[PDB]
């Protein structure tokens, strides 16, 4: 089984996830909408609105991503090991993992049967695009909550992001999170390469991030759509 310390680490992460991830999106409010993926909105009363985009959703996506990232910042802030870090490292780690942590969270509300992200009263529907493949591949592994939250930790405490001072401490923390994940898998799951499959997905996800940031910077120069918080994340001025 797992050491008492490993059990405390998983517990701390699971509690942070609970306190900071509203899976029903009940508090996602006042977002922009394209004026009068496809987007579905169910009202409390039974009505459904549907947007089919042309053969402009970006203001809305920016609002969604921003809501997601605020939750990620909170997640991080609840973790003791992250709190102990100097402020500039906290910023550099969050700038480096924001995209990845959002995607991992979004994976947990992705339905592979219907190709839909089910975000409370909202749904996004639509796979050689790497982002869509990632969601299918990651979903096929059928990870537990605890595996997701350890993947988030491993992505957050990456020692090699642009601007990290405490590289050695962060590398140590990453490795303890990885060992706990390896052990969690040994003690609960044949699934003989699951841990490495998880790490390969992180790597792929680190590469989609690069591509997607490049694309979003291009679009943002022509047609500005990003929230203030996104602009900070992208180094936009």
């Amino acid at each position: 089984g797992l050491t008492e310390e490993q059990r405390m680490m998983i517990r701390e992460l699971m509690d942070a996830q609970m306190k900071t991830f509203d899976t029903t999106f009940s508090h996602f409010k006042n977002f922009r909408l394209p004026g009068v993926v496809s987007l579905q909105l169910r009202g409390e009363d039974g009505s459904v609105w549907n947007y089919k985009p042309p053969a402009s959703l970006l203001p809305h996506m920016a609002d969604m991503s921003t809501y997601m990232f605020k939750g990620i910042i909170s997640f991080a802030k609840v973790i003791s090991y992250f709190r102990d870090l100097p402020i500039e490292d906290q910023i550099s780690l969050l700038k480096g993992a924001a995209f990845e942590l959002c995607q991992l969270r979004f994976n947990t509300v992705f339905n592979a049967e219907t190709g839909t992200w089910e975000c409370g009263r909202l749904s996004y529907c639509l796979l050689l695009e790497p982002m869509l493949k990632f969601h299918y591949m990651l979903k096929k592994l059928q990870l537990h909550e605890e595996e997701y939250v350890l993947m988030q930790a491993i992505s957050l405490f990456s020692p090699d992001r642009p601007g990290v001072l405490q590289h050695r401490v962060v590398d140590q923390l990453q490795e303890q999170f990885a060992i706990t994940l390896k052990s969690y898998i040994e003690c609960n799951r044949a699934h003989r390469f699951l841990f490495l499959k998880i790490m390969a997905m992180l790597t792929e996800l680190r590469s989609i991030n690069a591509q997607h940031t490049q694309r979003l910077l291009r679009i943002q120069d022509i047609h500005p759509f990003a929230t203030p918080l996104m602009q900070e994340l992208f180094g936009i001025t």
Binding site: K77, I87, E88, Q90, I91, K95, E232
Partner: peptide, 15 residues
């Protein structure tokens, strides 16, 4: 500098 170019993050982190 890093905190100066990320005022909102900084703020959200401090609360």
């Amino acid at each position: 500098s890093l905190t100066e170019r990320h005022k909102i993050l900084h703020r959200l982190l401090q609360e």
